[PDB]
UniProtKB/Swiss-Prot annotation, chains A, B, C:
The keyword Transmembrane applies. It comes from Gallus gallus (Chicken). Belongs to the TMEM38 family. Keywords: Ion channel, Ion transport, Membrane, Nucleus, Potassium, Potassium channel, Potassium transport, Sarcoplasmic reticulum, Transmembrane, Transmembrane helix, Transport. It catalyses: K(+)(in) = K(+)(out). It is a multi-pass membrane protein. Ca(2+) binds at residue 67. Homotrimer; conformation seems to be controled by binding to diacylglycerol (DAG). GO terms for molecular function: identical protein binding; potassium channel activity. Its main location: membrane. Residues 1-12, 67-78, 120-137, 195-202 are lumenal. Channel activity is activated by a change of voltage within the sarcoplasmic reticulum lumen and blocked by luminal high Ca(2+) levels. This is Trimeric intracellular cation channel type A. The gene is TMEM38A.
Length: 224, 224, 224
């Protein structure tokens, strides 16, 4: 009955709870960046735009690669408003109370695990979306699923440019971090599953690969 | 009978007279930039391409955001040729006579006022165009109308890159100028008018907001 | 019977032999770049991505200008695999034997001449493709044919950025090289031929302009 459990796991509604955890962890990483708090005070619109890049950068990159509107996902008003509320509560909550609650390690590890549920589902969705437009475009499937999982990391050089920072000596492609490298393995596995060369159901691959990302990210977050 | 006057005001043909004033003021600002005259002598094609960015950057940004061809507007041959003639007359007219005529303050203030007529119409057109593709995409309407009014300012970091200049410590989003900040207020007003939440006709909003931009820009130009 | 010869010349199958020569010369130029060999050892994926930019940058730029998927051409699996094999054989062949064979001057000059056959055909294809979408878009035809011939040269500033290099003081538009400047003349000639204002058959223009590029590039390669 594992496939019955994996089907319910791979079909959980990501909105709004799982997307909220994705937004919280992403905007928390934004606040950790240098000058982010100062930027939210002096340039609040640029700070909000930076948070939208962290929350929706995966959709922006996928739409750019597929020749679609890079802000197509911003038509989902509920998701944009929810991400805006997360950005406001993390940077402007009185007593910084929202930051204190989500940074609590037992609460943070749960949001980190819920973010990996959204990431793996986003990788598979990128492969399936590209396959619908190119039935045999294996390199397009792998590229689309890769940026859907890496997200804002692949546009870090220009996320820094929006903040007024320019460090061209490195990029996430020249030196991949763990989520970027893991999303590359993920988009290859989901592409092979699309080719029917990887004999496994799509729900089982979502379940097993999400648990791999959950165990890795929770261990990496709790260690540091 | 104000709505009768506002209807005639909001429907004036921008081509070619009002677009010419838009091109003249934009290329004049290009010539004010450092090394622009030297660039027109040593790299004339790059100088012409820079002038097209100042004349058509609003259309380039809007088409990029909506996933359309960024040079789609360059199919309008009459507008491209007219902008090319303005660029040639400003940089290469014998005795620099064309520059002397358009830089005359009474003539320059008229071209500045006529440019604001094109800008406000461009903001409203960006909101209406985005609404046609997304009936409830409020954030897409606001983004499209914003870049239609700001124009080349939002791509200043890469307009400088084309000229061989790189100043990443600032950008028009991190520190907005007046036209960029005013276009943000304008695209919100025209979006609210599209939502039918702002109880005012589209022609009255075009008339009142253009006069606001005309008064501000003419006062800012005559002061300095 | 020249038009009979020019028709057979302008219709030779570029795949796979002529495209292979295009890939070999392009990846050879990549290996000549600073730090390229070191990059292939420490960042092999970024090195492969760099080689795809040299092999397919003309298609990436044309699809970007026309608002199509910038990786649309990567659906051609045979071409991507062939370019990947060329990249692997140039950087990782035992004894560096593949590099030694293709760098042999009599063999290199043949691959250089075969690359110009692909470039001129790519320029004409860009003009014809843009004309199909814009029957009278002369500036769109010229821009599309230009990037189809220049290729990765017009994106050199960002090909360097992928490698961790940033030299913004110059670009291929501010200071054109010979292939970039020749592709600009080529796309104007093929556009004029599309307008029916240049009284010459499309096959004769392909034949005469390819021989011009072959003579120039072979002379430039053998001299240095
Ligand atoms: Ca498109
Ligand atoms: Cl940083
Ligand atoms: Cl602000
Ligand atoms: Cl998704
Ligand atoms: Cl997707
Ligand atoms: Cl098919
Ligand atoms: Cl400057
Ligand atoms: Cl030039
Ligand atoms: Cl418009
Ligand atoms: Cl528009
Ligand atoms: Cl609808
Ligand atoms: Cl270099
Ligand atoms: Cl790697
Ligand atoms: Cl082609
Ligand atoms: Cl093409
Ligand atoms: Cl037509």
């Amino acid at each position: 009955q594992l496939g019955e459990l994996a089907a319910a796991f791979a079909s959980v509604p990501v909105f709004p709870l799982f997307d909220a955890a994705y937004f919280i962890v992403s905007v928390l990483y934004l606040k950790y960046e240098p000058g982010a708090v100062e930027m939210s005070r002096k340039s609040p619109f640029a700070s909000w735009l930076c948070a939208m890049l962290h929350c929706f950068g995966s959709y922006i990159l996928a739409d750019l690669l597929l020749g679609e509107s890079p802000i197509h996902y911003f038509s989902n008003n509920s998701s944009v408003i929810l991400a805006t509320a997360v950005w406001y509560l993390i940077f402007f909550c009185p007593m910084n109370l929202f930051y204190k609650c989500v940074s609590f390690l037992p609460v943070k590890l749960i949001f980190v695990a819920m973010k990996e549920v959204v990431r793996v589902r986003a990788i598979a969705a990128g492969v399936h979306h590209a396959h619908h437009q190119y039935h045999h475009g294996w390199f397009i499937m792998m590229a689309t699923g890769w940026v859907k999982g890496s997200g804002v990391a692949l546009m870090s050089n220009f996320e820094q440019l929006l903040r007024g920072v320019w460090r061209p000596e490195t990029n996430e492609i020249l030196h991949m971090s763990f989520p970027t490298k893991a999303s590359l393995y993920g988009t290859v596995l989901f592409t092979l599953q699309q080719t029917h060369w990887l004999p496994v159901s799509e729900a089982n691959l979502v379940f097993f690969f999400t648990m791999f990302m959950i165990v890795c990210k929770v261990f990496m977050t709790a260690t540091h």
